[PDB]
Amino acid sequence: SIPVGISLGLLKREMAQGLLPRLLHGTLIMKESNFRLVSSEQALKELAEHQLRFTCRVHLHDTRKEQETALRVYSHLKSVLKDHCVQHLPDGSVTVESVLLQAAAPSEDPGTKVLLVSWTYQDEELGSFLTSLLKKGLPQ
Amino acid sequence: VVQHGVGLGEALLEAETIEEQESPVNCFRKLFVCDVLPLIINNHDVRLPANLLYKYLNKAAEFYINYVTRSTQIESKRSSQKYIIEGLTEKSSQIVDPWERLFKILNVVGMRCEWYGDI
Amino acid sequence: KSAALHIDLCKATSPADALQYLLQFARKPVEAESVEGVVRILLEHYYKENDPSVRLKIASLLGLLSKTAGFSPDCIMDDAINILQNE
Numbered sequence: 408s409i410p411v412g413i414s415l416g417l418l419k420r421e422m423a424q425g426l427l428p429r430l431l432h433g434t435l436i437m438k439e440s441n442f443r444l445v446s447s448e449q450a451l452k453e454l455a456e457h458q459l460r461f462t463c464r465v466h467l468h469d470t471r472k473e474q475e476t477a478l479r480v481y482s483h484l485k486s487v488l489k490d491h492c493v494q495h496l497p498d499g500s501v502t503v504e505s506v507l508l509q510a511a512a513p514s515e516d517p518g519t520k521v522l523l524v525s526w527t528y529q530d531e532e533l534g535s536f537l538t539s540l541l542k543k544g545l546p547q
Numbered sequence: 548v549v550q551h552g553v554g555l556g557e558a559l560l561e562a563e564t565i566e567e568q569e570s571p572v573n574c575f576r577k578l579f580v581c582d583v584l585p586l587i588i589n590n591h592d593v594r595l596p597a598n599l600l601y602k603y604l605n606k607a608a609e610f611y612i613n614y615v616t617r618s619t620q621i622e623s624k625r626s627s628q629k630y631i632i633e634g635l636t637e638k639s640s641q642i643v644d645p646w647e648r649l650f651k652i653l654n655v656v657g658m659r660c661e662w663y664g665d666i
Numbered sequence: 667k668s669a670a671l672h673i674d675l676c677k678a679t680s681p682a683d684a685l686q687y688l689l690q691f692a693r694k695p696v697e698a699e700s701v702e703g704v705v706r707i708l709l710e711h712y713y714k715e716n717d718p719s720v721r722l723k724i725a726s727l728l729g730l731l732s733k734t735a736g737f738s739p740d741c742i743m744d745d746a747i748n749i750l751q752n753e
Contacts, residue, residue: 424623474654474662494625497646498666499654509665525665629752637751 409442411435417446428491429504432529462525465538469547473510473520474499480508506530548586549593555583556602571609572618573633574640580610581648588648588655600656607652614645668703675707680715685723692727698736705731705742712749 421431435444450456469476481501485492492503500509506526513521526534548555563569563576571577584607587593595603617630632640671691678687696704705728712724728746732739 427623429623472662474657478654495644495647495650497650499650500665507665636748 411442411444413444414446414449416449417444430529460525461531462523463531464521465524466519466521468519477510504530506534548583549590549595553598553602555599556606559583559606568633570618570620572613572616572620574617574630574635575633577610577613577645578640578642580606580613581642581645584610584648584652588651591655591658594659603652603656607649611645611649668700668707671700671704672707675711680720681717684711684715684720688723688727692730696731696734698734698738701731701734701737705745709745709749 417431432447433444434447434450435442436450451458477499484501484503488503492501494502496502496507496509498509500507502508506524508524509522511522513519524534551558559579562579563571566575568576584603587603614628619631620633621631626644629637631637675684675687678684691704708724708727712721715721715724728742731737732742
């Protein structure tokens with residue numbers, strides 16, 4: 408077994424999540440004759456820390472309006488996810504785990520509607536699988 | 548509410564006066580405002596004039612101000628806050644996601660007229 | 667004579683001497699009306715004070731008062747669940 412240390416805040420959050428499915432990330436730095444794990448927020452103290460985030464675009468073609476479709480998507484997701492979502496955001500946005508879903512207008516084209524979604528790799532695989540499942544079949 | 552028109556504001560003022568609590572920082576006023584907003588949110592076909600929209604916006608702003616902070620008068624993740632209710636247990640105020648209620652009210656308003664970071 | 671207890675508690679310094687005064691008050695016996703008064707005084711000082719150990723001692727004294735046979739603990743139960751929600 409490899410002995411390493413864990414930041415107290417990360418362990419507290421992990422225990423709180425476990426008490427009341429979610430998996431914990433891991434980020435470690437090789438140290439002098441030892442290894443230590445550190446959270447993403449705490450790792451920024453090493454400064455530099457230039458953060459880069461991917462934001463993939465999901466394109467859909469439908470004549471229905473935005474806000475009502477967003478409400479329908481929220482209802483469908485909260486039904487599928489077995490009520491794992493018990494939080495909301497003020498600007499009509501619903502978030503699951505660590506992925507943000509918000510309504511954004513396109514750049515210049517009025518004839519096409521495009522939204523922006525950002526996620527990490529662990530969230531990227533789940534998001535890709537869920538989008539493929541949605542594209543497989545829906546009451547459309 | 549649609550038939551009454553501008554009478555909703557007068558009814559709310561009369562209810563507040565009857566309650567013997569002029570200040571709207573009480574949790575009861577915020578709960579009543581949220582309940583009034585959900586009724587309008589449920590029916591998206593109820594068009595209202597400019598005065599009604601302005602009154603609704605003012606009521607929503609007052610409710611949000613009350614919910615953000617309340618007076619201390621006495622006589623896997625989630626979001627919530629804390630406050631002191633007027634003569635009742637704090638757990639009695641069963642209100643979930645006031646910001647979502649404001650978002651739904653804005654959505655209903657937009658639906659009537661067909662309408663770095665994330666926001 | 668609840669006034670004597672109230673003024674003695676007020677004159678007592680919050681960090682250290684308050685603990686000793688509360689202990690001394692706890693060891694001596696109490697009466698039903700005296701319990702009914704000192705519980706509200708304890709709750710008010712519990713709201714006022716924010717130290718961990720002092721609040722722990724106030725909770726312990728609340729437990730000791732609750733075990734009193736002759737007392738009618740009804741409103742203090744409500745205040746206890748309220749502070750439980752706030753603790």
